[PDB]
């Protein structure tokens, strides 16, 4: 019995953005939080206070509410997952397991499609604010004498914040999880010799196929969380100019804000995927204990 399916994400059609079920649903919202801190050090862009208090939160509420619209679509997929993962409750109606599988992907892709499409105007607002941000940075009076103290100051704060999260623990865990998961995949394939009946092994293979999706999700965020860590440190160990042009300071703020927001985003997803992978490991093993009892 899967009780929460918050591990389903959706990307835009051109793949620039990534929607998640957990707040704030976009790493773009965490960038907007970061830029709040940058505006504190610049008096000429003091209006970002009102941008953040009003427009960014109004985007977050509309994000959360447009997510809530997919609620019925979410449990429709959730109702199919529980049928396919539990042999006893698959027996409560006769539909070809293959047909029920096709219904699962229909409803799934329908549900994931709901996440994207009902958030079309919210990505429009992420784009607006981003353009709104860059127009506001024009009000900095420096033109080529722009100070990089803020930039390198925030880098120092990030590096301390990157120490807090246990990357190695997350990394060690997935290496063991994937290594054993593939072993169960090879085992089931090799052992269906002795199994006369497939419905409980079909439930095993379904959970294993959903275990693959979450693993890849886990590796994507882990790979992008490492990427953020590595490249901000790469900025902290390189040349440190103290002055730069106005347009390159915009790039600068957008760079570190991006890397940190993505990191905060990955941190939010890895904790959830970690739970999801453990929970699916209990359902699989219960069916394995189910499978072996029927071997007699």
């Amino acid at each position, epitope marked *: 019995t899967t009780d929460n399916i918050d591990y389903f994400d959706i990307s835009d059609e051109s793949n620039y953005y990534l929607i998640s079920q957990l707040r704030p649903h976009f790493s773009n919202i965490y960038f907007f939080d970061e830029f709040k801190r940058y505006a504190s050090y610049h008096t*000429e862009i003091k209006r970002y206070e009102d941008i953040h208090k009003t427009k960014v939160n109004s985007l977050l509420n509309e994000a959360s509410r447009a997510i809530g619209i997919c609620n019925r679509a979410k449990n429709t997929v959730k109702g199919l997952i529980n049928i396919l993962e539990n042999p006893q409750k698959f027996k409560t109606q006769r539909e070809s397991y293959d047909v029920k599988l096709r219904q699962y992907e229909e409803k799934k892709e329908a549900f994931r499609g709901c996440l994207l499409n009902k958030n079309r105007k919210n990505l429009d607002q992420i784009k607006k604010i981003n353009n709104e941000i860059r*127009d506001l940075l024009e*009000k*900095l009076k420096c033109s080529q004498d722009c100070q990089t103290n803020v930039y390198f100051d925030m880098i120092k704060i990030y590096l301390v914040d990157f120490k807090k999260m246990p990357y190695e623990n997350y990394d060690t865990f997935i290496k063991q999880y994937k290594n054993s998961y593939l072993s169960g995949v090879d085992m089931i394939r090799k052992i269906e010799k002795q199994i006369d009946n497939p419905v409980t092994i079909n439930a095993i293979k379904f959970t294993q196929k959903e275990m693959g999706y979450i693993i890849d999700r886990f590796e994507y965020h882990l790979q992008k969380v490492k990427h953020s860590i590595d490249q901000v440190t790469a900025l902290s160990d390189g040349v440190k100019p103290k002055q730069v042009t106005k347009n390159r300071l915009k790039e600068y703020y957008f760079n570190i804000g991006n890397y940190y927001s993505i990191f905060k985003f990955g941190k939010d997803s890895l904790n959830m995927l970690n739970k999801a992978l453990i929970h699916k490991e209990k359902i699989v093993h219960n069916l394995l204990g189910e499978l072996f009892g029927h071997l007699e």
Partner: antibody, heavy 118, light 108 residues
Framework: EVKLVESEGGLVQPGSSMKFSCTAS????????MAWVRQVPGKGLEWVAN????????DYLDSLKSRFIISRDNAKNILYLQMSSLKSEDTATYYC???????????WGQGTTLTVSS | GDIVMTQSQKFMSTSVGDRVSVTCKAS??????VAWYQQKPGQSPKALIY??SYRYSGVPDRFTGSGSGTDFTLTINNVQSEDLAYFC?????????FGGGTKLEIKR
């Protein structure tokens, strides 16, 4: 495309009051600062006041912070400028203007004439 | 309290084919925070350029903006009879302030 339509203007005696309004269409009212600008016929422009997105912080020209109130109704997409204790110096054509993130005025209404006279 | 934008020239003589630059002086350094407006006879002002140099969409490319710091200039290529007044505006600090305006005085 973007339309700013100001209420009818009028003639007022010194000391009385008049409230102007401005209805906005063709853009998300709540996404922009809005402002009022006044111009004496044949003369230059003068900024009067402006209002932020939710209407929490209005700001004015110091001389008029006393007598002028700017307000917004985001649900009805209308900007208001309430004036009190008016004088002859206040006679002008008042423009409803949409303010940029920086402080520019991207779009202007057609103006509404206020005449202060006995 | 005070920033003054000065358009010292109230009228500027020109011809229809010409290209003319209109100047606006700021009392202090306002960086790039300058915008340019036109006002034809009997019309509300219309925006042309912001950030001293950036042209709004749909504004003809015969309008160009230059300047930084305290001296800003609007350039109007291929003058037309329909052209008249031009106002500069600073949005660096409150209160916002406009220049006195400059009108083209065409010779025929």
């Amino acid at each position: 495309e973007v339309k700013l339509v100001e209420s009818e203007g009028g003639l007022v005696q010194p000391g009385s009051s008049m409230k102007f309004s401005c209805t906005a269409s063709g853009f998300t009212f709540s996404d922009y600062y809005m402002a009022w600008v006044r111009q004496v016929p044949g003369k230059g422009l003068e900024w009067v006041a402006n209002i932020n997105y939710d209407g929490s912080t209005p700001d004015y020209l110091d001389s008029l912070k006393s007598r002028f109130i700017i307000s917004r109704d985001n649900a009805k997409n209308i900007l208001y400028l309430q004036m009190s204790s008016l004088k002859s110096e206040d006679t002008a054509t008042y423009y409803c203007a949409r303010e940029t993130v920086v402080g520019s005025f991207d779009y202007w209404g057609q103006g509404t004439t206020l005449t202060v006279s006995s | 309290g005070d920033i003054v934008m000065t358009q010292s020239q109230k009228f500027m003589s020109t011809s229809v084919g010409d290209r003319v630059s209109v100047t606006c002086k700021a009392s202090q350094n306002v960086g790039t925070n300058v915008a340019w407006y036109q006002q034809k006879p009997g019309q509300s002002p219309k925006a042309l350029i912001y950030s001293a140099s950036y042209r709004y969409s749909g504004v003809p490319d015969r309008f160009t903006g230059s300047g930084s710091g305290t001296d800003f200039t609007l350039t109007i290529n291929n003058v037309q009879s329909e052209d008249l007044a031009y106002f500069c505006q600073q949005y660096n600090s409150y209160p916002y302030t406009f220049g006195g305006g400059t009108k083209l005085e065409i010779k025929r």
